[PDB]
Amino acid sequence: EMEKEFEQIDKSGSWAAIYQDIRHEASDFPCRVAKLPKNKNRNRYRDVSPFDHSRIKLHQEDNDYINASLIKMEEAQRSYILTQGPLPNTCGHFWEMVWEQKSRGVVMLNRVMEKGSLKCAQYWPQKEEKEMIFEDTNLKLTLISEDIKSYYTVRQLELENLTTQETREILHFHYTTWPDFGVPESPASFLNFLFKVRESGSLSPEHGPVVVHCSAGIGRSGTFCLADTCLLLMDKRKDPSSVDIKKVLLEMRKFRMGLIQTADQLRFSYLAVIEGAKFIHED
Ligand SMILES: Cc1ccc2nc(C(F)(F)F)cc(N3CCNCC3)c2c1
Ligand SMILES: Cc1ccc2nc(C(F)(F)F)cc(N3CCNCC3)c2c1
């Protein structure tokens, strides 16, 4: 079915109309903590905030606030943490969250710089011999190795809690080739990247939730979790054509606002689910 709906929407040029519908219908819940005066320098964008009911709380009190949300999908039996790209003053909070929530993987869907503007802090070490220390949260981070490919990079990191000298292996999955403008023409590399994350075991119930981000933590990040979930649901259910991608996206929007930011991103998500279901000189 999904193939044939996609065909009609493309023919009618109705992606923008469907997208405005999703926006009109979405949930609204309060975000009072995000809006406190003391939290102004913890938010990259004033119009992207976590709902109170689903925000992640830091355990090192004094201030428990981080721009991050728990997306808990009940039928699919998978959880994710969606967060903004860390700021220069929130990298310590980011790693504190990964530690406290027992995450095994971090998924990054942007480059630090795009279009000559900073989108995310350099929150991980680029060289084995030059480790990072976060003095405010008492954490050390070391690059162990990396595997660089044409469309994405996988890094092995070691995260140490200095208060206890406990260490843990964290996998960093970095999609390095999403366009400055628009979306990928083909979802093939996006699909190979998802399979890599799945195959690592980073998504399994034995771990804490995977941490997923882009710059705001709602657009590209939304496409990742929406596609993962719908593909889980295509497998679990007896007719995969029962899976309503609009309905799934509305359910996820109960836990974080804004997920999928453009009509182009909504079409790509459809596209990625249609293609992933099949496995289960101008310049
Ligand atoms: C046999 C098999 C089973 C499940 C798979 N799932 C995906 C998916 F995108 F992770 F869902 C991608 C998959 N492939 C991996 C190999 N290249 C194309 C994408 C895949 C392959
Ligand atoms: C045949 C067709 C029909 C409708 C389309 N609509 C969009 C839109 F941006 F999602 F509105 C993007 C579309 N794509 C984006 C990716 N490159 C081809 C144009 C599109 C393509």
XYZ file of N, CA and C in Angstrom, residues 2-245:
732
model
N 1.788 1.394 0.954
C 2.566 2.642 1.181
C 3.150 3.200 -0.122
N 3.665 2.297 -0.955
C 4.135 2.619 -2.318
C 3.104 3.359 -3.209
N 1.854 2.947 -3.090
C 0.816 3.516 -3.893
C 0.303 4.862 -3.369
N 0.170 4.995 -2.029
C -0.087 6.332 -1.426
C 1.013 7.329 -1.803
N 2.275 6.906 -1.644
C 3.404 7.751 -2.015
C 3.244 8.227 -3.489
N 2.918 7.292 -4.404
C 2.670 7.633 -5.790
C 1.604 8.748 -5.974
N 0.439 8.622 -5.289
C -0.604 9.653 -5.336
C -0.194 11.011 -4.785
N 0.495 11.007 -3.611
C 0.893 12.265 -2.976
C 1.896 12.993 -3.873
N 2.866 12.251 -4.439
C 3.821 12.828 -5.398
C 3.125 13.459 -6.627
N 2.153 12.728 -7.202
C 1.401 13.176 -8.376
C 0.587 14.442 -8.107
N -0.068 14.489 -6.937
C -0.872 15.658 -6.541
C -0.040 16.819 -5.941
N 1.246 16.599 -5.624
C 2.063 17.609 -4.941
C 1.530 17.997 -3.555
N 1.092 16.975 -2.820
C 0.367 17.212 -1.561
C 1.187 17.018 -0.278
N 2.531 16.988 -0.397
C 3.409 16.791 0.757
C 3.270 17.958 1.763
N 3.260 19.175 1.241
C 3.157 20.348 2.148
C 1.818 20.392 2.891
N 0.734 20.048 2.171
C -0.638 20.035 2.782
C -0.688 18.960 3.901
N -0.121 17.782 3.616
C -0.144 16.733 4.624
C 0.678 17.125 5.857
N 1.880 17.678 5.603
C 2.707 18.197 6.666
C 1.977 19.281 7.548
N 1.296 20.279 6.937
C 0.565 21.304 7.710
C -0.482 20.645 8.576
N -1.128 19.597 8.065
C -2.107 18.801 8.831
C -1.533 18.211 10.101
N -0.391 17.535 9.952
C 0.347 16.956 11.106
C 0.615 18.029 12.143
N 1.119 19.163 11.682
C 1.391 20.290 12.608
C 0.129 20.777 13.310
N -0.977 20.933 12.577
C -2.248 21.373 13.188
C -2.747 20.427 14.283
N -2.597 19.125 14.035
C -3.074 18.028 14.911
C -2.161 17.696 16.087
N -0.861 18.126 16.055
C 0.039 17.741 17.107
C -0.336 18.202 18.494
N 0.075 17.342 19.426
C 0.033 17.593 20.896
C 0.693 18.910 21.325
N 0.152 19.543 22.374
C 0.815 20.616 23.053
C 0.747 20.400 24.558
N 1.919 20.421 25.200
C 2.079 20.210 26.624
C 3.013 21.281 27.174
N 2.959 21.545 28.496
C 3.808 22.681 28.964
C 5.326 22.317 29.020
N 6.126 23.376 28.926
C 7.604 23.310 29.027
C 8.070 24.391 29.981
N 7.514 24.390 31.191
C 7.849 25.433 32.163
C 9.328 25.399 32.590
N 9.879 24.219 32.799
C 11.272 24.190 33.280
C 12.243 24.764 32.224
N 12.018 24.395 30.961
C 12.865 24.902 29.856
C 12.898 26.417 29.798
N 11.778 27.032 30.166
C 11.603 28.475 30.103
C 12.054 29.286 31.357
N 12.478 28.600 32.400
C 13.066 29.364 33.557
C 14.214 30.256 33.131
N 14.303 31.451 33.735
C 15.406 32.353 33.387
C 16.796 31.708 33.479
N 17.064 30.947 34.530
C 18.394 30.306 34.652
C 18.725 29.285 33.572
N 17.703 28.833 32.811
C 17.967 27.842 31.766
C 18.160 28.411 30.367
N 18.189 29.731 30.243
C 18.254 30.402 28.934
C 19.528 29.945 28.181
N 20.661 29.899 28.868
C 21.923 29.484 28.179
C 22.098 27.950 28.009
N 21.085 27.150 28.337
C 21.092 25.712 28.087
C 20.259 25.271 26.822
N 19.653 26.247 26.164
C 18.788 26.026 24.985
C 19.427 26.667 23.751
N 19.656 25.834 22.735
C 20.228 26.348 21.469
C 19.214 27.263 20.775
N 17.929 26.847 20.784
C 16.859 27.583 20.083
C 15.664 27.886 21.001
N 15.175 29.116 21.020
C 14.117 29.429 22.012
C 12.773 28.779 21.660
N 12.615 28.345 20.410
C 11.348 27.717 19.934
C 11.366 26.163 19.884
N 12.455 25.571 20.391
C 12.575 24.120 20.578
C 12.883 23.778 22.019
N 11.896 23.260 22.728
C 12.014 22.901 24.143
C 11.454 21.509 24.439
N 11.952 20.832 25.464
C 11.366 19.550 25.925
C 10.103 19.757 26.794
N 9.085 18.911 26.620
C 7.928 18.970 27.483
C 8.360 18.550 28.892
N 7.726 19.187 29.888
C 7.978 18.784 31.247
C 7.802 17.315 31.538
N 6.713 16.683 30.996
C 6.380 15.327 31.384
C 7.406 14.259 30.907
N 8.123 14.593 29.818
C 9.058 13.618 29.244
C 10.538 14.058 29.235
N 10.844 15.212 29.825
C 12.271 15.680 29.866
C 13.180 14.750 30.655
N 14.463 14.706 30.205
C 15.456 13.931 30.961
C 15.989 14.850 32.102
N 15.972 14.314 33.346
C 16.519 15.040 34.515
C 17.988 14.573 34.788
N 18.897 15.530 34.844
C 20.276 15.232 35.376
C 20.234 14.938 36.893
N 21.094 14.028 37.366
C 21.137 13.568 38.783
C 22.043 14.385 39.692
N 22.929 15.117 39.076
C 23.706 16.108 39.696
C 22.801 17.352 39.618
N 22.050 17.439 40.707
C 21.287 18.629 41.177
C 22.089 19.887 41.616
N 21.349 20.940 41.987
C 21.809 22.316 41.754
C 21.123 22.835 40.473
N 21.196 22.071 39.368
C 20.295 22.329 38.244
C 20.192 21.042 37.429
N 19.016 20.442 37.362
C 18.785 19.177 36.712
C 18.411 19.329 35.193
N 18.473 20.499 34.624
C 17.944 20.758 33.262
C 18.952 20.476 32.095
N 18.463 19.684 31.128
C 19.082 19.481 29.807
C 17.998 19.424 28.686
N 18.272 20.046 27.541
C 17.286 20.046 26.426
C 17.291 18.642 25.767
N 16.573 17.710 26.346
C 16.493 16.291 25.962
C 15.189 15.647 26.416
N 14.654 14.714 25.606
C 13.359 14.099 25.862
C 13.387 12.585 25.731
N 12.703 11.840 26.576
C 12.559 10.403 26.422
C 11.337 10.061 25.554
N 11.560 9.445 24.377
C 10.516 8.942 23.498
C 10.368 7.475 23.750
N 9.215 7.093 24.353
C 8.995 5.717 24.823
C 7.874 5.110 23.975
N 8.232 4.281 23.002
C 7.252 3.694 22.069
C 6.803 2.334 22.602
N 5.510 2.255 22.965
C 4.971 1.141 23.746
C 4.787 -0.154 22.926
N 4.059 -0.074 21.813
C 3.868 -1.258 20.884
C 5.177 -1.770 20.270
N 6.030 -0.837 19.821
C 7.313 -1.182 19.185
C 8.337 -1.671 20.211
N 8.119 -1.339 21.492
C 9.021 -1.739 22.593
C 10.461 -1.211 22.411
N 10.599 0.069 22.111
C 11.890 0.737 21.930
C 11.755 2.135 22.558
N 12.839 2.564 23.208
C 13.001 3.932 23.696
C 14.188 4.627 23.042
N 14.102 5.936 22.905
C 15.128 6.834 22.388
C 15.179 8.118 23.243
N 16.367 8.703 23.378
C 16.510 10.098 23.890
C 16.850 11.033 22.727
N 16.011 11.984 22.419
C 16.241 13.016 21.422
C 16.707 14.265 22.116
N 17.842 14.797 21.685
C 18.452 15.982 22.291
C 19.048 16.912 21.207
N 19.210 18.191 21.510
C 19.853 19.156 20.675
C 21.371 18.845 20.625
N 21.986 19.381 19.595
C 23.444 19.352 19.494
C 24.022 20.121 20.687
N 24.978 19.505 21.436
C 25.455 20.255 22.654
C 26.072 21.622 22.341
N 25.886 22.543 23.285
C 26.488 23.866 23.292
C 27.881 23.790 23.994
N 28.743 24.780 23.744
C 30.051 24.815 24.457
C 29.969 24.667 25.968
N 28.861 25.101 26.578
C 28.653 25.043 28.030
C 27.791 23.873 28.521
N 27.303 23.045 27.590
C 26.490 21.889 27.953
C 27.084 20.527 27.522
N 28.391 20.500 27.073
C 28.988 19.195 26.729
C 29.148 18.260 27.943
N 29.553 18.891 29.086
C 29.582 18.135 30.332
C 28.204 17.530 30.732
N 27.155 18.345 30.601
C 25.762 17.832 30.855
C 25.324 16.685 29.927
N 25.727 16.799 28.646
C 25.452 15.766 27.654
C 26.054 14.434 28.111
N 27.400 14.458 28.424
C 28.027 13.193 28.842
C 27.538 12.653 30.198
N 27.130 13.620 31.083
C 26.502 13.219 32.347
C 25.192 12.402 32.087
N 24.418 12.918 31.134
C 23.172 12.203 30.718
C 23.425 10.794 30.163
N 24.456 10.673 29.283
C 24.790 9.376 28.736
C 25.209 8.390 29.849
N 26.085 8.863 30.747
C 26.427 8.077 31.916
C 25.197 7.630 32.778
N 24.449 8.629 33.234
C 23.307 8.343 34.168
C 22.188 7.450 33.548
N 21.956 7.623 32.251
C 20.889 6.847 31.577
C 21.385 5.506 31.051
N 22.707 5.239 31.167
C 23.275 3.925 30.804
C 23.211 3.633 29.303
N 23.265 4.692 28.506
C 23.251 4.587 27.010
C 24.561 3.908 26.554
N 24.474 3.093 25.515
C 25.619 2.443 24.850
C 26.002 3.135 23.544
N 25.045 3.772 22.880
C 25.280 4.466 21.654
C 24.825 5.890 21.569
N 25.509 6.715 20.792
C 25.153 8.095 20.414
C 25.095 8.150 18.860
N 23.966 8.624 18.324
C 23.741 8.853 16.923
C 23.748 10.336 16.585
N 24.660 10.755 15.728
C 24.787 12.130 15.270
C 24.460 12.285 13.786
N 23.610 13.228 13.432
C 23.120 13.309 12.068
C 23.469 14.637 11.366
N 24.469 15.348 11.874
C 24.861 16.645 11.315
C 26.412 16.711 11.347
N 26.977 17.741 10.716
C 28.421 18.136 10.840
C 28.462 19.354 11.794
N 29.554 19.494 12.527
C 29.786 20.624 13.448
C 29.578 21.973 12.772
N 30.055 22.112 11.550
C 29.798 23.303 10.751
C 29.062 22.956 9.446
N 28.012 23.719 9.147
C 27.275 23.613 7.881
C 26.903 25.044 7.466
N 27.160 25.337 6.196
C 26.938 26.651 5.587
C 27.674 27.788 6.278
N 28.860 27.489 6.779
C 29.678 28.447 7.481
C 29.118 28.846 8.838
N 28.227 28.033 9.405
C 27.709 28.307 10.758
C 27.832 27.084 11.660
N 28.139 27.345 12.924
C 28.251 26.302 13.924
C 26.857 25.787 14.246
N 26.731 24.473 14.158
C 25.530 23.733 14.477
C 25.580 22.871 15.747
N 26.794 22.565 16.201
C 27.031 21.684 17.308
C 28.475 21.931 17.826
N 28.697 21.773 19.110
C 30.031 21.832 19.699
C 30.843 20.563 19.322
N 32.198 20.705 19.346
C 33.110 19.557 19.182
C 33.182 18.833 20.514
N 32.229 17.929 20.747
C 31.984 17.319 22.046
C 32.674 16.011 22.323
N 33.437 15.550 21.292
C 34.219 14.328 21.408
C 35.674 14.639 20.891
N 36.640 13.885 21.435
C 38.044 14.035 20.979
C 38.323 13.476 19.588
N 39.035 14.266 18.816
C 39.471 13.885 17.446
C 40.769 13.114 17.320
N 41.549 13.086 18.370
C 42.832 12.378 18.386
C 42.978 11.550 19.691
N 43.445 10.308 19.555
C 43.632 9.337 20.629
C 44.415 9.962 21.811
N 45.485 10.650 21.488
C 46.377 11.232 22.503
C 45.937 12.540 23.171
N 44.797 13.104 22.733
C 44.314 14.354 23.293
C 42.884 14.138 23.835
N 42.830 13.482 24.988
C 41.531 13.255 25.632
C 40.867 14.542 26.164
N 39.533 14.435 26.413
C 38.732 15.521 26.981
C 38.334 15.275 28.440
N 38.499 16.325 29.245
C 38.025 16.284 30.624
C 36.906 17.327 30.793
N 35.743 16.877 31.287
C 34.627 17.802 31.662
C 34.623 18.064 33.173
N 35.232 19.184 33.555
C 35.496 19.481 34.986
C 34.210 19.615 35.815
N 33.156 20.183 35.227
C 31.892 20.407 35.943
C 31.132 19.124 36.307
N 31.212 18.084 35.472
C 30.562 16.817 35.756
C 31.493 15.630 36.083
N 32.792 15.925 36.200
C 33.786 14.969 36.628
C 33.859 13.709 35.788
N 33.971 13.961 34.488
C 34.030 12.895 33.457
C 35.243 13.066 32.536
N 35.836 11.932 32.131
C 36.938 11.880 31.106
C 36.460 11.102 29.881
N 36.819 11.601 28.700
C 36.428 10.958 27.433
C 37.682 10.789 26.506
N 37.899 9.557 26.079
C 39.063 9.212 25.238
C 38.611 8.534 23.921
N 39.190 8.995 22.811
C 39.019 8.273 21.522
C 39.885 7.012 21.483
N 39.303 5.833 21.318
C 39.994 4.559 21.238
C 40.330 4.154 19.818
N 39.386 4.303 18.899
C 39.601 4.007 17.456
C 38.443 4.573 16.661
N 38.596 4.625 15.353
C 37.474 4.933 14.472
C 37.573 4.278 13.094
N 36.413 4.006 12.501
C 36.294 3.429 11.175
C 35.566 4.452 10.287
N 36.325 5.103 9.409
C 35.824 6.146 8.558
C 35.426 5.565 7.213
N 34.131 5.717 6.860
C 33.647 5.337 5.518
C 33.140 6.501 4.710
N 32.706 6.245 3.453
C 32.354 7.353 2.536
C 31.111 8.106 2.975
N 30.142 7.418 3.630
C 28.857 8.045 4.059
C 28.686 8.273 5.580
N 29.454 7.527 6.385
C 29.399 7.634 7.849
C 30.699 7.159 8.516
N 30.832 7.479 9.798
C 32.022 7.143 10.634
C 31.506 6.520 11.934
N 32.118 5.403 12.370
C 31.845 4.767 13.642
C 33.057 4.889 14.563
N 32.886 5.501 15.751
C 34.007 5.627 16.713
C 33.792 4.798 17.969
N 34.883 4.257 18.513
C 34.914 3.612 19.838
C 35.434 4.623 20.811
N 34.599 5.016 21.792
C 35.018 5.944 22.849
C 35.039 5.258 24.231
N 35.909 5.755 25.120
C 35.912 5.305 26.548
C 35.531 6.472 27.474
N 34.404 6.274 28.203
C 33.879 7.281 29.114
C 34.156 6.831 30.545
N 34.851 7.682 31.295
C 35.194 7.350 32.701
C 34.565 8.347 33.678
N 33.902 7.785 34.685
C 33.421 8.592 35.843
C 34.575 8.792 36.825
N 35.142 9.995 36.849
C 36.345 10.240 37.697
C 36.079 10.082 39.208
N 34.823 10.287 39.632
C 34.452 10.174 41.039
C 34.616 8.727 41.521
N 34.418 7.782 40.598
C 34.449 6.369 40.957
C 35.501 5.535 40.257
N 36.104 6.103 39.206
C 37.044 5.435 38.275
C 36.426 4.269 37.469
N 35.104 4.153 37.502
C 34.350 3.250 36.613
C 34.508 3.698 35.152
N 34.751 2.765 34.215
C 34.776 3.093 32.768
C 33.722 2.291 31.981
N 33.334 2.873 30.859
C 32.386 2.241 29.905
C 32.734 2.543 28.458
N 32.551 1.536 27.585
C 32.646 1.741 26.127
C 31.348 2.353 25.544
N 31.483 3.475 24.842
C 30.395 4.169 24.106
C 30.683 4.132 22.606
N 29.687 3.749 21.781
C 29.846 3.794 20.315
C 29.259 5.068 19.781
N 29.963 5.785 18.944
C 29.555 7.029 18.295
C 29.266 6.745 16.793
N 28.019 6.850 16.356
C 27.594 6.597 14.967
C 27.322 7.957 14.344
N 28.192 8.395 13.461
C 28.114 9.709 12.880
C 27.821 9.656 11.373
N 26.614 10.064 10.988
C 26.247 10.189 9.588
C 26.809 11.510 9.097
N 27.795 11.430 8.179
C 28.579 12.599 7.812
C 28.247 13.303 6.504
N 27.233 12.780 5.796
C 26.930 13.224 4.442
C 25.500 13.703 4.211
N 24.773 14.128 5.240
C 23.462 14.748 4.993
C 23.668 16.159 4.374
N 22.971 16.485 3.236
C 23.130 17.755 2.465
C 22.967 19.011 3.328
N 23.657 20.103 2.964
C 23.518 21.405 3.656
C 22.050 21.890 3.467
N 21.545 21.783 2.240
C 20.159 22.092 1.917
C 19.409 20.830 1.518
N 18.239 20.643 2.107
C 17.349 19.565 1.732
C 17.653 18.237 2.370
N 17.276 17.160 1.690
C 17.442 15.803 2.186
C 18.277 14.957 1.188
N 18.764 13.759 1.625
C 19.474 12.867 0.655
C 18.562 12.452 -0.503
N 19.104 12.417 -1.721
C 18.353 11.954 -2.899
C 17.847 10.507 -2.761
N 18.665 9.660 -2.155
C 18.362 8.234 -2.000
C 18.543 7.926 -0.528
N 17.705 7.033 0.016
C 17.862 6.668 1.412
C 18.766 5.448 1.616
N 19.412 4.985 0.568
C 20.280 3.774 0.695
C 21.372 3.878 1.780
N 22.106 4.985 1.831
C 23.165 5.069 2.851
C 22.607 5.257 4.264
N 21.496 5.975 4.357
C 20.802 6.160 5.625
C 20.377 4.813 6.192
N 19.884 3.946 5.307
C 19.441 2.585 5.646
C 20.659 1.715 6.067
N 21.792 1.831 5.375
C 22.972 1.042 5.756
C 23.488 1.495 7.143
N 23.398 2.797 7.383
C 23.759 3.400 8.716
C 22.826 2.919 9.839
N 21.471 2.963 9.614
C 20.569 2.367 10.591
C 20.926 0.908 10.905
N 21.191 0.120 9.884
C 21.501 -1.315 10.086
C 22.737 -1.519 10.936
N 23.739 -0.654 10.727
C 24.948 -0.651 11.543
C 24.628 -0.370 13.044
N 23.722 0.560 13.271
C 23.404 0.894 14.681
C 22.667 -0.293 15.302
N 21.678 -0.836 14.548
C 20.951 -1.978 15.033
C 21.884 -3.149 15.338
N 22.846 -3.386 14.439
C 23.624 -4.596 14.515
C 24.623 -4.488 15.694
N 24.974 -3.261 16.096
C 25.857 -3.061 17.260
C 25.285 -3.512 18.592
N 23.957 -3.662 18.667
C 23.248 -3.948 19.932
C 22.930 -2.702 20.774
N 23.298 -1.532 20.270
C 23.051 -0.265 20.968
C 21.586 0.062 21.200
N 20.687 -0.586 20.454
C 19.250 -0.317 20.523
C 18.485 -1.339 21.378
N 19.198 -2.307 21.925
C 18.551 -3.419 22.556
C 18.133 -3.062 23.997
N 17.114 -3.771 24.519
C 16.594 -3.479 25.873
C 17.578 -3.645 27.019
N 18.632 -4.424 26.819
C 19.635 -4.603 27.856
C 20.396 -3.310 28.152
N 20.338 -2.322 27.255
C 20.991 -1.014 27.494
C 20.015 0.069 27.795
N 20.516 1.207 28.292
C 19.700 2.410 28.317
C 19.378 2.956 26.941
N 18.474 3.931 26.841
C 18.148 4.398 25.471
C 19.307 4.996 24.680
N 19.339 4.759 23.362
C 20.279 5.449 22.445
C 19.985 6.951 22.495
N 21.019 7.758 22.453
C 20.948 9.194 22.366
C 21.062 9.626 20.923
N 20.093 10.323 20.385
C 20.069 10.776 18.993
C 19.971 12.290 18.923
N 20.810 12.924 18.111
C 20.766 14.329 17.862
C 21.143 14.781 16.478
N 20.756 16.020 16.184
C 21.160 16.812 15.022
C 21.477 18.220 15.601
N 21.142 19.328 14.975
C 21.356 20.645 15.655
C 20.252 20.940 16.703
N 18.991 20.978 16.252
C 17.814 21.180 17.200
C 17.303 19.882 17.857
N 17.599 18.705 17.306
C 17.118 17.417 17.852
C 15.634 17.093 17.558
N 15.115 17.640 16.451
C 13.712 17.374 16.029
C 13.570 17.039 14.535
N 14.418 17.593 13.649
C 14.227 17.354 12.200
C 14.817 16.049 11.691
N 16.115 16.069 11.444
C 16.774 14.848 11.005
C 16.656 13.764 12.059
N 16.765 14.131 13.366
C 16.666 13.169 14.452
C 15.326 12.441 14.410
N 14.281 13.262 14.151
C 12.926 12.704 13.943
C 12.860 11.652 12.842
N 13.560 11.907 11.735
C 13.511 10.971 10.610
C 14.122 9.627 11.031
N 15.240 9.658 11.762
C 15.855 8.417 12.272
C 14.953 7.537 13.151
N 14.367 8.137 14.170
C 13.567 7.347 15.096
C 12.259 6.928 14.421
N 11.714 7.804 13.579
C 10.379 7.494 12.897
C 10.535 6.313 11.939
N 11.652 6.298 11.212
C 11.902 5.223 10.290
C 12.210 3.900 11.043
N 13.074 3.954 12.078
C 13.377 2.768 12.929
C 12.092 2.159 13.484
N 11.237 3.015 14.077
C 10.025 2.504 14.699
C 9.092 1.871 13.661
N 8.805 2.579 12.591
C 7.832 2.037 11.603
C 8.390 0.710 11.076
N 9.710 0.622 10.808
C 10.284 -0.670 10.347
C 10.160 -1.768 11.400
N 10.340 -1.439 12.682
C 10.031 -2.406 13.784
C 8.582 -2.878 13.700
N 7.685 -1.954 13.377
C 6.276 -2.256 13.441
C 5.864 -3.084 12.213
N 6.568 -2.910 11.089
C 6.309 -3.697 9.866
C 6.632 -5.158 10.061
N 7.613 -5.402 10.894
C 8.033 -6.747 11.260
C 7.113 -7.407 12.280
N 6.751 -6.667 13.323
C 5.947 -7.195 14.427
C 4.543 -7.601 13.976
N 3.995 -6.865 13.014
C 2.606 -7.011 12.618
C 2.412 -7.917 11.422
N 1.194 -8.438 11.331
C 0.846 -9.376 10.276
C 0.642 -8.736 8.898
N -0.044 -7.596 8.786
C 0.088 -6.805 7.541
C 0.876 -5.510 7.808
N 2.145 -5.464 7.338
C 2.939 -4.233 7.258
C 2.252 -2.999 6.609
N 1.186 -3.210 5.818
C 0.424 -2.099 5.213
C -0.586 -1.501 6.198
N -0.733 -2.159 7.349
C -1.380 -1.592 8.542
C -0.604 -0.404 9.146
N 0.700 -0.293 8.877
C 1.512 0.732 9.547
C 1.246 2.097 8.929
N 0.717 2.988 9.765
C 0.361 4.339 9.335
C 1.436 5.296 9.840
N 2.284 5.738 8.928
C 3.414 6.543 9.274
C 2.997 7.908 9.909
